[PDB]
Design a protein around this ligand. Structure first.
Ligand SMILES: NC(=O)C1=CN([C@@H]2O[C@H](COP(=O)(O)OP(=O)(O)OC[C@H]3O[C@@H](n4cnc5c(N)ncnc54)[C@H](O)[C@@H]3O)[C@@H](O)[C@H]2O)C=CC1
Ligand SMILES: Cc1cc2nc3c(=O)[nH]c(=O)nc-3n(C[C@H](O)[C@H](O)[C@H](O)COP(=O)(O)O)c2cc1C
Ligand code: SF4
Ligand code: SF4
Ligand code: SF4
Ligand code: FES
Ligand code: FES
Ligand SMILES: [K+]
Lengths: 44, 213, 263, 430
């Protein structure tokens, strides 16, 4: 049924201090190979 | 409060800091978000990861982040002194941040700041002697319609009265964690006397999609 | 040729593409004031003393960093250019300490000289000034950081020409402090040239400190012999005694730098 | 059309603004998101730029630059360097909390907007520079980005269109100036958030040296709705050169402080008395309104009766629209204390790079802190006016402008109250 009274965004009550970084570690496999500037750093 | 560093026995380049191995995997994931040749772009997330590991930044996390990213250490010192989240001093376990800009001051954030002060016995900037609470006074946290509000390490505690923030500090002293939200009847940002908008059901897919698409 | 035509106070001048407003005004013999700009360092654009009016443009441009567009009339002596200069000199002198007699840069100070040439003649600052903690960067460069105007010629020299990357700005806002953030000793082979390019008395020569004063020195133009570079120097002397050694500009040798041994 | 506002729920772009529906992928698809995205990507960059230019969409960051004209600066062939969309999600403006609600409650709308916008400009990926204080919101956005990668909606072969597009979230670290686009670009690069000078613009030299567009959350998230519903639908709202819908953040001294989407050229009085429950103590209790966040100058109660909440009507009210974050101040307010706290914000949030902001914003804070007590003489109001004019226009970015402007609005509309503050200080302390 349709509902408009309950707050559906309850997932952030159970985020720890490493939630963002574990999600980035999970997402690191879904991504394209990064572009290269041809050098390792501008001091190279 | 000082933007120079002096070597103390608790904070020196021989203070032991090192990342945990799963933090090394998270640093690898951070560095693989940026182009080859600009590994120096990962200074802010890896230094924030060092702070989330250690609680604050001694000047061995700054040097380790400078080493594992191959950037000069002064360019990590600049970032750590520029941004206000990086704790260059060891803060308490619950680092309370009371917002006292104009939209929160208009809704009496001074009452909550006084309530936290007479609840903890400390003032702005001080840490409780059991190292559980550090009270500071911050700028706009971006929760202005839920004013007055605080932040306790990750979480926004909103629409507060002094009784609400005393209850939050009580059940933080009990080892529990409170719910990060408004303390009034409302849920996130709606009007408290019912919705003035978005009361109809949403229209779903394909509603009003133009021709030629 | 692909030279574009620009105008400095209406005078036509043909400049290369990529020329900044300051260089286009330099080609007609006008020197725009500056504190952070230095023609051998990268462009900072963070003192706003070079703010000049382009006509039919309701905003002053940073002449050290803005490239000239074709057909611009640069107004170097207009009224809002002068208002920009006096306002920026007012903000430069707001927190600057009253140290001109006890300062070694006195008489040879850029901040003094173009406060005389471009600033106003009095203050509206009725507040308490700031005071910056002094840094210890070695036995050569005396550091009094209250006199710092945060022009970041330090950081650009030590990052680009000295190649050290160990000076920077810590803090934020009016509390932004130039330094090493740690008790570090900036000892490069060219480390005394930040004395030269500090426009103010925030970085002076610690051996030269308190001894002389620029108007009474006799500038003799000579050669370095400490190495085989043949660095062209000014030996400034006062009453038959050698006081210090400053560089001469020679684009083919030492462009305007010398080593610490020479200095 | 002459009267604007009373926006119906069928024209709301940001449905599930309040958290009442599912924010995740199955709930976002059931409200219209990710519908025919493959067709929008296959119709090309020029079609999407034409739909944004037709819509009259101006930049929701607060400056109101035209979005299609801005994004067309990237419509150019490559020069070896990659291209990037950078989504501005800092939102450090006091009064403003709208981008928090878009990221937190409609995240897939922001991710689909990243895909459509970065398609229109040939961008390789999207860097959402979210505010660091929005940690739960950033993890919320990361869960939605993982749901979009796992469904094939972004990443390799995004939505089945053959256009590869990644989406990254970079978190800030507590600097308001890192929402300024060049300072944000420098903050992504691992440096201090100090604004670059302009030119080079980000479309020429942006993040990492690459061609870049920095765009707000709200001007990005409305773009799939603009490309689905059409530009003419979006241009059917608001006045001409003032098109669309706008999120409004009514906070301060109102009965029901809320975030609401409303039509563009809505009156201020209609917005406050409809969606916020009115001013506390009635409309006669109104003293002044800061119309669109802390950077805009305030307007007194006499201007708030008739003025419309778009860009041009607030420019004619010698203020700005800004972030459209309405700060309402009643008659019980020491307005000098509120504006001086606002300038205290602007000196705590100032990176120190150029001389006029670094020095003059601290000097305006010292003068305003004396003006709260009245520890001054009435020549210093004109002194502070000229100091604000010296800061304004002479800085690198618009935080110098944004610090000079509330001082100017306070002086312009409340000089007699400043004068009587100072003269009662002078009589009871001498
Ligand atoms: N949303 C927020 O949280 C906040 C918003 N603001 C707003 O920010 C505004 C100032 O921002 P700015 O970006 O400095 O204003 P505006 O002068 O620069 O320009 C806005 C946009 O237009 C682009 N643009 C303008 N002229 C251009 C040109 N010739 N070529 C290429 N691109 C061009 C800029 O790149 C920028 O992205 C203020 O009006 C204020 O209301 C201020 C503080 C916080
Ligand atoms: C000091 C300062 C802070 C700013 N902060 C933000 C911000 O937090 N979020 C934002 O979207 N724009 C911010 N802006 C405006 C941006 O410069 C830029 O105009 C905008 O983010 C992207 O343009 P858009 O309006 O077309 O989206 C800020 C501007 C200044 C001068
Ligand atoms: S640096 Fe210049 S203006 Fe400052 S005290 Fe020295 S001589 Fe005076
Ligand atoms: S010490 Fe001198 S050269 Fe260095 S930033 Fe300060 S004023 Fe500039
Ligand atoms: S005006 Fe202020 S915010 Fe802008 S570059 Fe200068 S110090 Fe930074
Ligand atoms: S003013 Fe306190 S959250 Fe924005
Ligand atoms: S000389 Fe151009 S700003 Fe310093
Ligand atoms: K000097």
């Amino acid at each position: 049924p349709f509902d408009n009274t309950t707050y559906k965004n309850l997932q952030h009550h159970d985020y720890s201090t490493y939630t963002f970084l574990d999600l980035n570690l999970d997402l690191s496999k879904f991504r394209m190979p990064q572009p290269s500037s041809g050098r390792e750093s501008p001091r190279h | 409060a000082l933007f120079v560093h002096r070597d103390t026995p608790k904070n020196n380049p021989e203070t032991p800091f090192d990342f945990t191995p799963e933090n090394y995997k998270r640093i690898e994931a951070i560095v693989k978000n940026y182009p080859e040749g600009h590994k120096a772009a990962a200074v802010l997330p890896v230094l924030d990861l060092a702070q989330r590991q250690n609680g604050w930044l001694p000047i061995s996390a700054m040097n380790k982040v400078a080493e594992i990213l191959q950037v000069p250490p002064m360019r990590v010192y600049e970032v750590a002194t520029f941004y206000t989240m990086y704790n260059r001093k060891p803060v308490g376990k619950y680092h309370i941040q009371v917002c006292t800009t104009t939209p929160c001051m208009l809704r009496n954030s001074d009452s909550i700041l006084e309530a936290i002060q007479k609840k903890l016995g400390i003032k702005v900037g001080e840490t409780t002697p059991d190292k559980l609470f550090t009270l500071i006074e911050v700028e706009c946290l971006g929760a202005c319609v839920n004013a007055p509000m605080v932040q306790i390490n990750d979480n926004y505690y909103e629409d507060l009265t002094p009784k609400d923030i005393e209850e939050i500090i009580d059940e933080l002293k009990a080892g529990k964690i409170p719910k990060p939200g408004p303390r009034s009847g409302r849920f996130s940002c709606e009007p408290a006397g019912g919705l003035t908008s978005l009361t109809e059901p949403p229209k779903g897919p394909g509603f009003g999609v133009q021709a030629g698409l | 040729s692909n030279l574009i035509e620009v105008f400095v106070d209406g005078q036509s001048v043909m400049v290369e593409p990529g020329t900044t407003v300051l260089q286009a005004c330099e080609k007609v013999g006008m020197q725009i004031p500056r504190f952070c700009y230095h023609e051998r360092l990268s462009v900072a654009g963070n003192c706003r003393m070079c703010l000049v009016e382009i006509e039919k443009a309701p905003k002053v441009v940073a002449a050290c960093a803005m490239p000239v567009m074709k057909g611009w009339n640069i107004l170097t002596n207009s009224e809002k250019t002068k208002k920009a200069r006096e306002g920026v000199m007012e903000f430069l002198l707001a927190n600057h300490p009253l140290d001109c007699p006890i300062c070694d840069q006195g008489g040879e100070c850029d901040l003094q000289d173009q406060s005389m040439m471009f600033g106003s003649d009095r203050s509206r600052f009725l507040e308490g000034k700031r005071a910056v903690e002094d840094k210890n960067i070695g036995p050569l460069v005396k550091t009094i950081m209250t006199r710092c105007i945060q022009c970041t010629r330090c950081i650009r020299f030590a990052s680009e020409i000295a190649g050290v990357d160990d000076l920077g700005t810590t803090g934020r806002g009016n509390d932004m402090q130039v330094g090493t953030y740690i008790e570090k000793m900036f000892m490069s082979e060219l480390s005394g040239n930040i004395i030269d390019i500090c426009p103010v008395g925030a970085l002076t020569s610690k051996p030269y400190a308190f001894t002389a004063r620029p108007w009474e020195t006799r500038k003799t133009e000579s050669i370095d012999v400490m190495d085989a570079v043949g660095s062209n120097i000014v030996v400034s002397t006062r009453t038959g005694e050698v006081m210090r050694i400053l560089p001469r500009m020679h684009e083919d040798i030492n462009e305007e730098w010398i080593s610490d041994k020479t200095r | 059309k002459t009267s604007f506002g009373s926006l119906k729920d069928e024209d709301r772009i940001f449905t599930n603004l309040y958290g009442r529906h599912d924010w995740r992928l199955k709930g976002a698809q059931s409200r219209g998101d990710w519908y025919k995205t493959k067709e929008i990507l296959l119709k090309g960059p020029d079609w999407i730029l034409g739909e944004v230019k037709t819509s009259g969409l101006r930049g929701r960051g607060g400056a109101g630059f035209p979005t299609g004209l801005k994004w067309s600066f990237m419509n150019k062939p490559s020069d070896g360097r990659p291209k990037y969309l950078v989504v501005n999600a800092d939102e450090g403006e006091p009064g403003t909390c709208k981008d928090r609600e878009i990221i937190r409650h409609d995240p897939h709308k922001l991710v689909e907007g990243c895909l459509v916008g970065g398609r229109a400009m040939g961008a390789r990926a999207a860097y959402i520079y979210i505010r660091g204080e929005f940690y739960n919101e950033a993890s919320n956005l990361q869960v939605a980005i993982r749901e979009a990668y796992e469904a094939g909606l972004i990443g390799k072969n995004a939505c089945g269109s053959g256009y590869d597009f990644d989406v990254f979230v970079v978190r800030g670290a507590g600097a308001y100036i890192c929402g300024e686009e060049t300072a944000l670009i420098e903050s992504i690069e691992g440096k201090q958030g100090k604004p670059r000078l302009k030119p080079p613009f980000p479309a020429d030299v942006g993040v990492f040296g690459c061609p870049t567009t920095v765009a707000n959350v709200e001007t990005v998230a409305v773009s799939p709705t603009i490309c689905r519903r059409g530009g003419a639908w979006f241009a059917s709202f608001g006045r001409e050169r003032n098109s669309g819908t706008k999120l409004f953040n009514i906070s301060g001294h109102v009965n029901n402080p809320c975030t609401v989407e409303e039509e563009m050229s809505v009156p201020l009085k209609e917005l406050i008395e409809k969606h916020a429950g009115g001013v506390t103590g009635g409309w006669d209790n109104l003293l002044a309104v800061i119309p669109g966040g802390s950077s805009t100058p305030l307007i007194p109660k006499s201007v708030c009766e008739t003025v419309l909440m778009d860009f041009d009507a607030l420019i004619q009210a010698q203020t700005g629209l800004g972030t459209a974050a309405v700060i309402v101040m009643d008659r019980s307010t020491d307005i000098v204390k509120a504006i001086a706290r606002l300038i205290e914000f602007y000196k705590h949030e100032s990176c120190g790079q150029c001389t006029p902001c670094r020095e003059g914003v601290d000097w305006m804070n010292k003068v305003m802190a004396r003006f709260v007590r009245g520890d001054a003489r009435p020549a210093e109001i004109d002194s502070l006016w000229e100091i604000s004019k010296q800061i304004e226009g002479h800085t690198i970015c618009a935080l110098g402008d944004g610090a000079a402007w509330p001082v100017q609005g306070l002086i312009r509309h409340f000089r007699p109250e400043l004068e009587e503050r100072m003269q009662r200080f002078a009589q009871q302390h001498q």
